[PDB]
Amino acid sequence: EFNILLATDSYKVTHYKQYPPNTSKVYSYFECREKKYEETVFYGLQYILNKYLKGKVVTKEKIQEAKDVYKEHFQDDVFNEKGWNYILEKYDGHLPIEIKAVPEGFVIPRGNVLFTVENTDPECYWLTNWIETILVQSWYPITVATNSREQKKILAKYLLETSGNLDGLEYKLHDFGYRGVSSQETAGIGASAHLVNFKGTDTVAGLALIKKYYGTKDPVPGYSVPAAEHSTITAWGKDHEKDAFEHIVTQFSSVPVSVVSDSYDIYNACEKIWGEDLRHLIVSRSTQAPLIIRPDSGNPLDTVLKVLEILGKKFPVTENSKGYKLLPPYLRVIQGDGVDINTLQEIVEGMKQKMWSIENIAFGSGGGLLQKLTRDLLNCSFKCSYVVTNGLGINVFKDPVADPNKRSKKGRLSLHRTPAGNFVTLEEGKGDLEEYGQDLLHTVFKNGKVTKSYSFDEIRKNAQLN
Amino acid sequence: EFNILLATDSYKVTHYKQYPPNTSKVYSYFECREKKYEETVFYGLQYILNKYLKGKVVTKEKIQEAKDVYKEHFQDDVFNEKGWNYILEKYDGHLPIEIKAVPEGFVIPRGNVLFTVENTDPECYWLTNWIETILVQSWYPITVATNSREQKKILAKYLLETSGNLDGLEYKLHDFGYRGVSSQETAGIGASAHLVNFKGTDTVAGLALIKKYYGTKDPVPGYSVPAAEHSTITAWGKDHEKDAFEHIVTQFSSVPVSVVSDSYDIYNACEKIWGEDLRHLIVSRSTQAPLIIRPDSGNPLDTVLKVLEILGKKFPVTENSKGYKLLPPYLRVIQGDGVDINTLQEIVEGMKQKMWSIENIAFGSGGGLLQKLTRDLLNCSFKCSYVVTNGLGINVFKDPVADPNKRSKKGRLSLHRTPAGNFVTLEEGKGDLEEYGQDLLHTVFKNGKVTKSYSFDEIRKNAQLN
C-alpha cells in the first residue's frame, strides 16, 4: 500500500531542521517558466489529489515503517516522527494543506502561476514542500496534454487549408504509446492527457483513470478500431501475406480496419496486393468501414508520399473543392512510426506540397506522444515564494546569477484576467488590491478534502482550440 | 485492482480472429536490436512477473469488466469472452504461458535473445502476444540500468586515471529523478534500475520495490545524505544566505551535508560565504562528514571548473599520487543540474585537462537518468518468430524493405556461449543440435508460477564492471 511518508525526495526528510526558526508558514507555487510552446494545458492535479493526498494518509504503522526505512537510508534518525505524529493525532492523519489551482483544461500562457500550496497549521510549515515531489509530477499530464494540443493545432491548420473543414480532427492522432512508456501508471496518466484533445486510443489504461478520477457523460472517453500487427501478418508465412490481408479485411468487413503493410515490402503490398490482388475487397467497403493502410518503417515523410502516389494510381482519386487530391472514402492511410510534433509538421507540409489532402492521412504516436517529454520542456518548476517567520511575511525567491530564466516569483500569488482578456500573475499579494477581477485560482484541496472537482467533459471544453 | 484483460494495446483484443486457422502455438521473443550502447543490462522482468502475471489474474468479475469496457471502446462485441473463460475454468485464472529469460543483471551484447514467450495450451495461442504490451515495458528498467552502467564506466575510467583507484565509485552518481519522472510507479522502477550500478538515491520508492520483488542482504539497497534545496535557503531571505548556510551545516555537523549554493550567486557563495565567512565551520569537519557544495545552474562544465578554481584558492589543496589536485577531505562538490551521459563525459574530461581529480566531484542526474530514455534507444522489440499451424512448425519473421535493421529472428531461439566465451543467439531451433553448450535461457515463468528468481545482490554481481 502507498505510504506518503515514503513518497518524497529523501533530502526533504531533513528540511524541517533547515527552515528559519519560528517559521509558521511556507507558501509555494507551480509554473511553467517562460523562456515553441507558448501556452500550456493545465491537467492532472485532480488525479494526484484523489489517489495520493486526500483522506487519512497517515497511520501509526506508516509512521513506524518510514522511521525504520529512513534510519537505515540515512544511517541516522533524522526522520520527523514528532511532526507526522502531530498530524495523525490532531487531524486524524489528514494533511493540513491548502492547494489552490486554475481549473483543469484551462490554457494558460507560460510564466503564470498554475497552482499554489500552503500549510494551514503553523506546526506543519515543513509539509508544504514535503509534498512537492508528488505534486511536481503533474508536469507529465500537463506536458502530454500541451504537446498533444500543439499537434492538434498543426493538424487543424493543414486539414482546414486542404479540405475547408475540421471534420474528424479529433481522430487524426491515435495513441499508440502503451508499450513505449515506462510503467502501467504512466500509461494511464499519459493516455488520459492525450484524450483531452483526441478520442482515438490503444492505451486502455487511460479510460479507467478518466472514469475513476474525472468522469464523462459518454460510457467511454476514447475509442479504437480492429488492427493488425506484424505477428498476425507474419504468422501466415512469408509467401502468404496476401492470404493474411484477405482473411483480416474479411473478418472486419463492417468496421474500419488498420492493416500493417510493411512486413516485407510496403510498396509491393500497396501496388500489387491491395492495388491488384485484393482491390475487389477494398472498393466494396463502406465509407464507415475503410481499409486503413499502415506503413511502419523507412523515412516517415518519403514513405507516406510514396504510398499515396502508389494508391493514387491504383484507386479512383478525386480532387476536392480546394484543389487537393482525395482517395476514395473506403481507403485511408495511417502513419504510426517515428511520429512526433516535428515529423508530424514535416509530413503534412510535404503532403500539401504534393497536393494531397490531410483528409487522406491519420497519425499514430507512441514514444513521441507519451515518453520523449521532460519536466524541462515547459520549464515546470515548484518554488517557495512566501514565508511567515516571527509573525512577519517575507517575499522569497531564487535568482541564480548564471541563469536569469531560473528567477522565481515573489510573495503571495494570484492569477487574473487582463483588460484585453489575457492572463497576468500578480506578485507580492498585490491581488488583494482588487484592481483586477477575481483570482482565477480556486481552492481544490483543503485539510485532507478535495474541495473542487472537474469532469473530463469540462476539461475538454476548456482545452478546445480557438 | 489491476486487470490484465485491460492491460494491453486495444487492437490485441481483435487478434484472436487474425491468426491462421488451426494455430496451436505462437512463440515470440524480446531483443535489443543491433545497430554506442554495445551491451545491455537485462533487468526488470522479475518485477513484472510477480506484480502483474503470476497467480490468479483472471476472475469472473474481471472478464465482465473487460467485456463492458471493450463493447463501448470498439462499439462492438469483439472481446474474446470465450477465450478468457477457458483460462478461468481450466487453469483457475492462471496464465498458460512459459517465459524463458537470461538471468537478471547479465550483460548481453545487442542483437541477442533476452526472453521468449509461448503458450502452453493450444487453445491459448492468442495469449502470447496479448501480454506483449506488459512484457515490452521491461525496455525501461533495461535501458535505465544500461545507461546507468555506461555512465559508471566513464566515471571508473576517469576516477582510476586521476586517482589510481575506484574508491567510492558506487556513490559517484546520485539519483535525483523522483520529481522528473512521469509517475510514482516509474520512479520506483527507474530508481531500482539505477541501484543495480550505484548506491546513492533520493528516490525512496526504489528501496521498497527492491525489498518486495528482489531482496538484499542489507536492510537497505540505497542511501542518502541530508541536503538543502532552494526553499530552505531562500526562506531565510536574500540578505541572509550566510545564516541559512551556517544553520544547516551546524544542524548536520557530524554527517555529510549537501548545500545548494546557487540561489543568488554561486561564485560569491563559494568564495565569500563558504571560503571566508564560514570557512571556520568547514575546515573543522571530519572526513566522514564533508560539506558538499551543489551548483545547480549555468553551463555545467564552466560552473564546475570555476567553483573548483574558487575553492582551490580558499582551501588547502593537495596533490595526489597521480599528480592531480585534491580538495581537503571535508570539502566536495556535486553537480546535479543538466547531467546526462554526454555532459558527464564532458565534465570529467574537462576536469582532467585542468588537473582536477574526479575524487573531488560527485554527480546527480534527474530527467537524464530516469526520464529522457525511449524504447528505441536500445532498439527494444518484441516479435513473433515461430508458430505451429496445422501441426506444422513455421519459422516467422518481418523484414521491411526500407529498414533491414527491423529484420527479426527466425524460428525457435536459444542463447549460447561461443568457443571464445562470447554470446550467440541460435535460430530455427539449431540450439537442439548441441554444437554449442546448453541454452543459457532459464524458464522464469510457467503456468501462473514464477519458476526462477534472482536476489538484488546476484543482479549487482552479474552487472559489475569488468
Curated annotation (Swiss-Prot), chains A, B:
Catalysis performed (reactions): beta-nicotinamide D-ribonucleotide + diphosphate = 5-phospho-alpha-D-ribose 1-diphosphate + nicotinamide + H(+)
CDD domains recorded: PBEF_like
The protein's enzyme class: transferase
Amino acids binding beta-nicotinamide D-ribonucleotide: 202, 294-296, 336-337, 367, 375
Domain of life: Eukaryota
Binding annotation for diphosphate: 179, 230, 294
Subcellular localization: Nucleus; Cytoplasm; Secreted
Xref: SUPFAM superfamilies: Nicotinate/Quinolinate PRTase C-terminal domain-like (SSF51690)
Pfam families: NAMPT_N, NAPRTase
Record-linked InterPro entries: Aldolase_TIM, DUF5598, N/Namide_PRibTrfase, Nicotinamide_PRibTrfase, Nicotinate_pribotase-like_C
Keyword entries, A-Z: Acetylation, Biological rhythms, Cytokine, Cytoplasm, Glycosyltransferase, Nucleus, Phosphoprotein, Pyridine nucleotide biosynthesis, Secreted, Transferase
Record text on activity regulation: Inhibited by FK866. FK866 competes for the same binding site as nicotinamide, but due to its very low dissociation rate, it is essentially an irreversible inhibitor.
Function noted in UniProt: Catalyzes the condensation of nicotinamide with 5-phosphoribosyl-1-pyrophosphate to yield nicotinamide mononucleotide, an intermediate in the biosynthesis of NAD. It is the rate limiting component in the mammalian NAD biosynthesis pathway. The secreted form behaves both as a cytokine with immunomodulating properties and an adipokine with anti-diabetic properties, it has no enzymatic activity, partly because of lack of activation by ATP, which has a low level in extracellular space and plasma. Plays a role in the modulation of circadian clock function.
Subunit and partners: Homodimer.
Protein name: Nicotinamide phosphoribosyltransferase
Organism, as annotated: Homo sapiens
Gene, per the UniProt record: NAMPT
